[PDB]
């Protein structure tokens, strides 16, 4: 009956496409055509951080917009003070191959993960005075690509096993598993209300998941691997930067592809995607060794950072919008303003 | 202008930087290697050989030192077939060790395809490959039987003659070496099809009982270091 199931699936996919086209009366560019452009957005490298020894694969800001954690292939997880360049912590990882780092909203814990398939959660507010591995979540069957905190006790982790997981840290078990993707899930963004999250994978498709219920609400379709994903500040849209030199903006309430940010002179791959606080600026890091700032509504380039010697592997905008931190494969983080 | 606490924080940062400089010296003095191969290929045998004689976990590490030079060799398990996404973590490894089972001709063609994918990879475009054509005691026992001819799997073998070059000095049947050199050339051609800096393939013939694999790796890595010295320091 596999033929019958495949035919029903094809008919349902065609119905989804027809319904999605029935709501595309106007395109985002048409509505945005009247509002004035941002103009040149020139941001200068204020503070540069020179502690790591190898390529930086991830960063994450803290909710205080002051501290930030960076993970390097040298087996180090450095918690930096942005304002003073001071190094607050230097956690030595048990595995040197780290692809993701997360800073808990409370500032107490910091998460790392990579080829070891383990999500290592480290405690920073211990009475002993040294950072210790609080827990090691060890249920994945593939490399960790992204970990984000929901609170001090729950984490969400995307892995190369085509599955995402929601872990209760104290129990150490996968509370929920998300099992829709057909390829390596490479990025992950958590909604501001922390009830939904979008995951981008190598199947050229993003998927929106309900954390509480475990299901996949809706799937958005790109023509290469989606390497970065980030919600709009609204919580009703998100952006996916992929291996083809495109960052696409989708909207949940319409189940569409609102805009496609691309340029004929960009042939590299987007590694990281972030939004400005207003949501009007979409910052994307590229293999071209530089970050491009797009206008998220007019779909035109607004600026170029261009201060790195190797590919920009991580990007993050603070909660207060003061700074955009870029981490590249040259062991340097740069705080642009 | 800094406060007392700010000065203490700066001093703590300088202490962290000192430990980071020590870790930098340790990280530089060690050579990272990546070990690839198929399940058929004898690959855990090689890690055992260079360990003894010198769960769902993903990365396996096998440290070993040769002539006071430390090597960290990484094997990647508990990962699926797709490799294009975690292979980027190995842009800076000194050498990629590829183990190909020369005994099995049926799976040989896909071994060449994996080698081609590794060789022509945008991230390993500057990464040398040390190639181990493993399980050759089984190759001799297979070619001295006549029940499996390479022509049944590689049609070009019938028109191949051993080159007027090196030969195994000890007693080896002159068509054992013909087949072995054909397997070698099938990889050497792919290596020389698209060559660049730091991108050179070192082919070696090995077995499970062989205890000299570590010396081979050390010599090849020394040559890789010499080439990077000749390039990054403008000598070529």
């Amino acid at each position, epitope marked *: 009956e596999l033929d019958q199931l495949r035919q029903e699936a094809e008919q349902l996919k065609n119905q989804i496409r027809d319904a999605r086209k029935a709501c595309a009366d106007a395109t985002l560019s048409q509505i945005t055509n009247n509002i004035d452009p941002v103009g040149r957005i020139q941001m200068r490298t204020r503070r540069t951080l020179r502690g790591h020894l190898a390529k930086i694969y991830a960063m994450h800001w803290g909710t205080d917009s002051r501290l930030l954690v960076s993970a390097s292939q040298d087996g180090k997880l450095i918690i930096w003070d942005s304002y*003073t360049t001071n190094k607050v912590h230097a956690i030595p990882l048990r595995s040197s191959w780290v692809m993701t780092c997360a800073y808990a909203p409370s500032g107490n814990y910091v998460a790392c993960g990579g080829l070891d398939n383990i999500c290592s959660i480290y405690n920073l507010k211990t009475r*002993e*005075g040294n950072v210790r591995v609080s827990r090691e979540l060890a249920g994945h069957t593939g490399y960790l690509s992204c970990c984000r905190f929901l609170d001090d006790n729950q984490i969400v982790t995307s892995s190369g096993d085509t599955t995402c997981a929601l872990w209760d840290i104290e129990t150490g078990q996968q509370t929920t598993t998300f099992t829709g993707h057909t390829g390596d899930v490479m990025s992950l963004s958590l909604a501001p209300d922390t009830r939904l999250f979008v995951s981008g994978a190598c199947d050229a498709s993003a998927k929106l998941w309900d954390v509480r219920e475990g299901m996949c609400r809706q799937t958005f379709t790109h023509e290469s691997d989606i390497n970065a994903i980030c919600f709009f500040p609204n919580g009703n849209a998100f952006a996916t930067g992929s291996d083809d030199a495109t960052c696409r903006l989708f909207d949940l309430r319409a189940d569409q592809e609102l805009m496609t940010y691309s340029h004929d002179n960009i042939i590299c791959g987007i590694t990281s995607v972030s939004f400005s606080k207003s949501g009007r600026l979409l910052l994307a890091g590229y293999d071209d060794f530089n970050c491009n700032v797009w206008d998220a509504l007019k779909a035109d380039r607004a600026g170029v950072l261009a201060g790195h010697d190797n590919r920009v592997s991580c990007l993050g905008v603070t909660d207060d919008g003061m700074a955009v931190a870029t981490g590249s494969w040259d062991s340097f983080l740069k705080i642009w303003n | 202008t800094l*406060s*007392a*606490e*700010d*000065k203490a924080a700066v*001093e*703590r940062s300088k202490m962290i930087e000192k430990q980071l400089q020590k870790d930098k010296q340790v990280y530089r003095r060690t050579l990272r290697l990546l070990l690839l191969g198929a399940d058929n290929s004898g690959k855990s045998t090689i890690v055992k050989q260079m360990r003894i004689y010198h769960k769902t976990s993903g990365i396996f590490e096998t440290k070993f030192q040769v002539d006071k030079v430390n090597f960290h060799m990484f094997d990647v398990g508990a990962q699926r077939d797709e490799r294009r996404k975690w292979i980027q973590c190995f842009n800076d490894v000194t050498a990629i060790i590829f183990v190909v089972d020369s005994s099995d001709y049926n799976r040989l063609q896909e071994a060449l395809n994996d080698f081609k994918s590794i060789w022509n990879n945008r991230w390993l475009r500057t990464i040398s490959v040390i190639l181990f054509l493993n399980k050759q005691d089984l190759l001799a026992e297979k070619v001295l039987a006549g029940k499996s001819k390479i022509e049944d799997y590689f049609p070009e073998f019938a028109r191949y003659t051993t080159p007027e070059d090196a030969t195994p000095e000890p007693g080896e049947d002159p068509r054992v070496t013909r087949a072995k050199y054909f397997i070698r050339k099938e990889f050497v051609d792919i290596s020389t099809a698209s060559g660049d800096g730091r991108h050179i393939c070192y082919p070696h013939f090995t077995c499970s009982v062989d205890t000299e694999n570590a010396r081979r790796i050390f010599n090849d890595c020394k040559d890789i270091i010499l080439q990077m010295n000749l390039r990054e320091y403008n000598l070529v």
Partner: single-chain antibody, 230 residues
């Protein structure tokens, strides 16, 4: 965390004595270490400070030259070598743990102290004794001759509590933050040169002497301390 100090006793004036505090239960090598003292019936007075890595040592004016502070990190023990003692140096000496980074709380743990008997941002706390009854809010005020609001943004005031017959315990660090393990009823507020600690719904086992300590510039100055009695 545990931190036990020993080496006290009777010293004839002009002698020399080595106090040693052994720290067990935390990363001693990554914490700065202070030596403070309390006279037989007086307030706290900072003596010395040895930084992590032994790269920054500070002494008090009434202490410089006579006293040498040092630490043995592998053995996890800090030593105060006191030379040419005087009658004014008799005190219970406390060894104070203190780490320094962004968000850190210095002066968390205090030792049990060693009794030794020998045979400047002035901080004033006018209330030397405030009568109190359990269940009522209390306010202890401290002033300073120099504003503690540094240009970075944070004021470096520390509120300590010393229960009868016990070592001082940190209550508030940097004038608004609450220490780890202290009840939420304690609150700190104020501006430079004027600070107030408010205990809402005082409950016994919080009576004792309350001290205010400045950390803007060395030497660190304490206060007389308000004595809350039930």
């Amino acid at each position: 965390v545990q931190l036990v100090e020993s080496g006290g006793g009777l010293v004839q004036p002009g002698g020399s004595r080595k106090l040693s505090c052994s720290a067990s239960g935390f990363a001693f090598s990554s914490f700065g270490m202070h030596w403070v003292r309390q006279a037989p019936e007086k307030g706290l007075e900072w003596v010395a400070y040895i930084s992590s890595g032994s790269g920054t040592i500070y002494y008090a004016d009434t202490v410089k030259g006579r006293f040498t502070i040092s630490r043995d990190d592998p053995k996890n023990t800090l030593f105060l070598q006191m030379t040419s003692l005087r009658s004014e140096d008799t005190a219970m000496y406390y060894c104070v743990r203190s780490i320094y980074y962004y968000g850190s709380s210095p002066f968390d743990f205090w030792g049990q102290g060693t009794t030794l008997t020998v045979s400047d941002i002035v901080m004033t706390q006018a209330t030397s004794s405030v009568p109190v009854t359990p269940g009522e809010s209390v306010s202890i005020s401290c002033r300073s001759s120099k504003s503690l609001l540094h240009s970075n943004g944070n004021t470096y005031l520390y509120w300590f509590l010393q229960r009868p017959g016990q070592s001082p315990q940190l209550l508030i660090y940097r004038m608004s933050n609450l220490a780890s393990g202290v009840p939420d009823r304690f609150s700190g507020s104020g501006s430079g040169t004027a600070f107030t600690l408010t205990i809402s719904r005082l409950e016994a086992e919080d009576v004792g002497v309350y001290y205010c300590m400045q950390h803007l510039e060395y030497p660190l100055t304490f206060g007389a301390g308000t004595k809350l009695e039930l």
